[PDB]
Design a protein around this nucleic acid. Structure first.
Length: 122
DNA sequence: CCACTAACCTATTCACACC
DNA sequence: GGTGTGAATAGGTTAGTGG
């Protein structure tokens, strides 16, 4: 099961596109400011910038550095909890990831990244 | 029915602390 | 240099949106 898909308002689409036009590689501060200005969680903004670059690069392919998020600290206790879940299921859905976010205290978007990285390496 | 695309995915690299 | 791992990139796949 995946998270419920958002639908942009015209005002949100305009703000996303205008910020993309200024810089298609925003850092965490730009993404957080834009997220709050338009009322959308920052991970959804980051996912949109990724999809929009893919749309623009593909269309350019047949027509033709801002600061990163600070490294999330993961305690040994949080890691062991994620590892136990990973051993049972490597592809948790949104509800399983929200459970892990609740139990660990980490943002669900960091849980999602943790599982993507772990699958690539183990 | 079907085009578009948010959400999610893989593969690989960048960043950075640590020794 | 080497290791570990969180956050990024390019770009493919799945499934909901709406003509």
């Amino acid at each position: 099961g995946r998270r419920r898909r958002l639908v942009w308002t015209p005002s949100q689409s305009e703000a996303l596109r205008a910020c993309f036009e200024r810089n298609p590689y925003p850092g965490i501060a730009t993404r957080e400011r834009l997220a709050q200005a338009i009322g959308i969680p920052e991970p959804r903004v980051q996912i949109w910038f990724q999809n929009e670059r893919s749309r623009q690069l593909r269309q350019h392919r047949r027509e033709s550095p801002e600061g990163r998020r600070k490294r999330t600290a993961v305690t040994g206790s949080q890691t062991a909890l994620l590892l136990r879940a990973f051993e049972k299921d490597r592809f948790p859905g949104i509800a399983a990831r929200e459970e892990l976010a609740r139990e660990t205290g980490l943002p669900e978007s960091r849980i999602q990244i943790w599982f993507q990285n772990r699958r690539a390496r183990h």
